[PDB]
A paper describes a structure:
OXA-48 confers resistance to many carbapenem and penicillin β-lactams, but only slowly hydrolyses oxyimino-cephalosporins such as ceftazidime (CAZ). Low catalytic activity for CAZ hydrolysis has been attributed to the substrate’s bulkiness, potentially requiring sampling of alternative loop conformations to promote cephalosporin binding and hydrolysis. Here we reveal how directed evolution of a β-lactamase yielded highly epistatic activity enhancements. We describe how distinct mutations shifted the rate-limiting step from substrate binding to the chemical reaction in the β-lactamase OXA-48, thereby causing strong phenotypic epistasis.
The F72L mutation disturbs this aromatic network, which probably reduces the thermostability and allows the Ω loop harbouring F156 and W157 to adapt a different conformation. Except for F72L, which reduced the Tm by 6 °C, the selected mutations barely affected the thermostability. To estimate how the conformational dynamics changed during evolution, we performed ensemble refinements based on the crystal structures of wtOXA-48, F72L and Q5. Despite their differences in resolution, both F72L and Q5 revealed an increased flexibility primarily resulting in the Ω loop adopting various alternate conformations. Notably, F72L allows the protein to populate a different conformational ensemble, in which the space created by the loss of the phenylalanine sidechain allows the neighbouring α-helix to slide toward the centre of the protein while increasing the conformational freedom of the Ω loop. This movement is accompanied by a tightening of an H-bonding network below the Ω loop involving T71, Y144 and Q169. F72L primarily decreased the dynamical correlation between S70 and the Ω loop, which agrees with the increased flexibility and improved substrate binding conferred by F72L.
Residue numbers in the entry:
A (entry chain A), B (entry chain B): 24 to 265
């Protein structure tokens, strides 16, 4: 059963923002959120789509492994970290659109769409075009749908090989210490109103896993750090992390 | 190739300690240590043996996956984290000897030596006999030999399945942040003099990986934190980590 907890709103209020955090306790099969309505609002995935994109690239052998280097094409771009060679680990880490655009062109439009459908990943909206779709059809996904997808990935239940899912979860590694491990992917949807920032993944504990998906209004990039900040604030409140 | 950097001795000296740090630059295929003689001294591996032990258990089906629970046997031991159910992840995190003894029980001495020999992990295995011979399956291994075995694991070149090696590499996840990822295993050999503490593994960077292996005289359990602290001071000094 889903349970709503407005007390989390204070963490959004504090930084003068608007959003939703969704948490799923895997042991208890119970969800929590500050807003069930927006928890179920579908938005563009932005770079959270790189999780299934990576699964598909690995499963088709377009990416051999997390070590294969994809060379910089020489065009310089506004994100300095993109102007360098990358492997799957660092392409995830820095959300390198040109690397993923080259994956997408090797995979194929139609296969991409089919294989995202096989994931139950958001809802139809299939164009376009090749490799960056939305415009006459952009997959949208709600935060709870992100949890549902992430749960299958965690349990290796998706319609791709087990190796593919293992390597993507390695590449999603964001933080680890003696208390918790976070595997997650950020996203920032700018090219259609309303601008929103994403953070989706899970926290592994010794004896439990907490899946989370959050999105929030992001009129400018000044607030991007708040994606992790507000999430951790909520994770601290619910005593998931210290 | 193998440079001796005696300026690292200051990091043991600082703590009135005695030991060796070994580093391997994977990109440059070049190694560094403060003591070439100690770097090649074979010690009992203690809990660093749990890295190859885990590979063997997975490859044989003794451990089905990283989620299989291994129930506590009801006998309380001195270390509180041992007195609970464990899976592969938490067993390695707290170095739970009763769990690994049950792995060894199912593997048997004979297969353990065949496989350790196939890994070229240290020297002697089952044939270990006479004088002090019952410990750590008769293995003695040096810090440079730890590096050799870790490099094979990193590259999935050991003679067990790729899946086995990927699962074990997940299980050694110790620390991760925006600057690096450490995969490693501690060890503390106490049943034979001189007592020594181990820390072995590697540091993943965007663009390189640095393998490390350190051991150090450890009279009392008081100074086990020095294993990581001295290592990190070498890593900081060499500008591997901030
Ligand atoms: Cl990992």
């Amino acid at each position: 059963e889903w349970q709503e907890n407005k007390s989390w709103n204070a963490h959004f209020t504090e930084h003068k923002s608007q959003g939703v955090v969704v948490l799923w306790n895997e042991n208890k099969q119970q969800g929590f959120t500050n807003n069930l309505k927006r928890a179920n609002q579908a938005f563009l995935p932005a770079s959270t789509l790189k999780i299934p994109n990576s699964l598909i690239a690995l499963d088709l052998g377009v990416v051999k492994d997390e070590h294969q280097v994809f060379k910089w094409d020489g065009q310089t771009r506004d994100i300095a970290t993109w102007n360098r060679d990358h492997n799957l680990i660092t392409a995830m880490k820095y959300s390198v659109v040109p690397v993923y655009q080259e994956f997408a062109r090797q995979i194929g439009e139609a296969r991409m769409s089919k294989m995202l459908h096989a994931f139950d990943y958001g809802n139809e909206d299939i164009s376009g075009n090749v490799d960056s779709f939305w415009l006459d059809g952009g997959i949208r996904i709600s935060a709870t749908e992100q949890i549902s997808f992430l749960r299958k990935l965690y349990h290796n239940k998706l319609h791709v090989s087990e190796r593919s899912q293992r390597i993507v979860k390695q590449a999603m590694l964001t933080e680890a210490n003696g208390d918790y491990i976070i595997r997650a992917k950020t996203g920032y949807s700018t090219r259609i109103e309303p601008k929103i920032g994403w953070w989706v993944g899970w926290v592994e504990l010794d004896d439990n896993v907490w899946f989370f998906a959050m999105n929030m209004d992001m009129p400018t990039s000044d607030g991007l750090g708040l994606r992790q900040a507000i999430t951790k604030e909520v994770l601290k409140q619910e005593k998931i992390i210290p």
